[PDB]
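Example with several molecule types.
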Amino acid sequence: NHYGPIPGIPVGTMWRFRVQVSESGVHRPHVAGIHGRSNDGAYSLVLAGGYEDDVDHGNFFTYTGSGCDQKLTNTNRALALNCFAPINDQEGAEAKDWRSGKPVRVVRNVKGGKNSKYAPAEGNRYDGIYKVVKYWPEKGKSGFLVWRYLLRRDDDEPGPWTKEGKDRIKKLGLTMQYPEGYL
Amino acid sequence: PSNHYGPIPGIPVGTMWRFRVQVSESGVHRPHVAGIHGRSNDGAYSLVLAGGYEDDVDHGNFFTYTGSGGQSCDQKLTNTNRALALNCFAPINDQEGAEAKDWRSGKPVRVVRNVKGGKNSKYAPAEGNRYDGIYKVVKYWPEKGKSGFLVWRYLLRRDDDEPGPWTKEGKDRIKKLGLTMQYPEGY
Amino acid sequence: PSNHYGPIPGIPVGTMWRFRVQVSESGVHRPHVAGIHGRSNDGAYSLVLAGGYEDDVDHGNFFTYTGSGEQSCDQKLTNTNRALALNCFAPINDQEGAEAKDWRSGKPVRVVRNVKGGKNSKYAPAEGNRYDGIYKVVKYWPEKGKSGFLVWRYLLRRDDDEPGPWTKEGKDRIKKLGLTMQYPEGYLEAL
DNA sequence: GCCTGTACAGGC
DNA sequence: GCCTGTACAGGC
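Resulting structure tokens for the full complex:
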């Protein structure tokens, strides 16, 4: 797979554990940080830190591929296929009409909080639909080539960190979801 | 692998997991949501008892079971319904069903009981998911469901030398093996 | 369907489409991007000549062809390389290749020429894609490419009673049939 | 890198 | 609604 938001799961929904995120369908892989098939596209990713060169500005963030040089295969190629431009594994690519691209469900996890004030203070939060604007190769903090992506928010649902996003969370009563018995 | 029949090495009867993804990663029941795993032209490998069909009856060592749709439509002996029927040591019959006189010679089914079965079974665990061992399909048959449409029904009977968790000896063995509820890492 | 061999009913030699999606919807060459359509244990149904390998030579009625993989790895007689070899009326041989004495008995390949082949062929159309008819694999062989790695090469030869678009009679027939560049619905109106 | 379906191999 | 690969059926 499903592209785009999950019905009944609005932006700002929160889960304590990744197993809950998986069961909800927002980000199916229990461990892996990106969900995609190389011959299709990418459906979801989790921002949980781990790459110091990534920048998180909320509506704009950069993302580093997985994965000794990296190849535009597996999930890296899948995320590229979301970009509204023909696939290119040499210089990368960029979409002028980036909004016509394939949607990516983005979840932020608390572990992204070291380098980003947009990360939730606890657990995992669904932050809405982002689009791949461009992607390119570069020599990262390991000497070898990494594939990097710029994603931009494209969602009428306001961001959880914005005024209208925080007001909607209070109106819907969306609180942190804990598994039965955990509390 | 996906089509493994029988017990998983290192996973005794009584093993407990909190979440379905753990049950899947262990190989005991691979589908995260579907209640049954099988291939329609091969057989069924595992099923999860989680409530749902009120006419199902669970007596631990054996239970009646209901197939799937895919109520507003007759069920069919296709897909996983057919897979489970193939386990019965009898020729497929999608008209009247069939019964294996030599039922132990049929294909094994790993059976997990889930906490949600507790509303309709005193054998469901109080939490999470529990592997209760190997069962065999004795017989299967169609009947008019509660809504007037056809459902496929199955009788499964336990064929496992590891004692059931509802027995004193099965509880004692589970304690000596040190089995505890397994949670995801860092939980 | 996907694995249809031979000409498409209602699609003569000389038919022209501006974009690859149109060529695909017609059944003539179904892959939008891949230059060859085939199943590795069956055969190849169609291919597109769009340039790309410098040592390929195109003489219209026949051409040399290179399979798929700067090359950094030997080619292999698998996937669509193997499918095209299977069209050759000879036992498959992945060591020296093979050659069919009775090459017309081989399986047919629908051949499309695309404008990008014009740099290396005077037979490419000036615009878009053109169906040029049925060809047969005469022979195929491995050789060292310019990179020094192995490439699989093929010789394809035309076996089609519809005259080639590069002949006077072929052009004249294309005119009488009224064939024109096919564009997507409302394409020129939007431009 | 046709498309929407379906199914198997193998994961552990 | 296990996963990610692969392959075929059939579109027109």
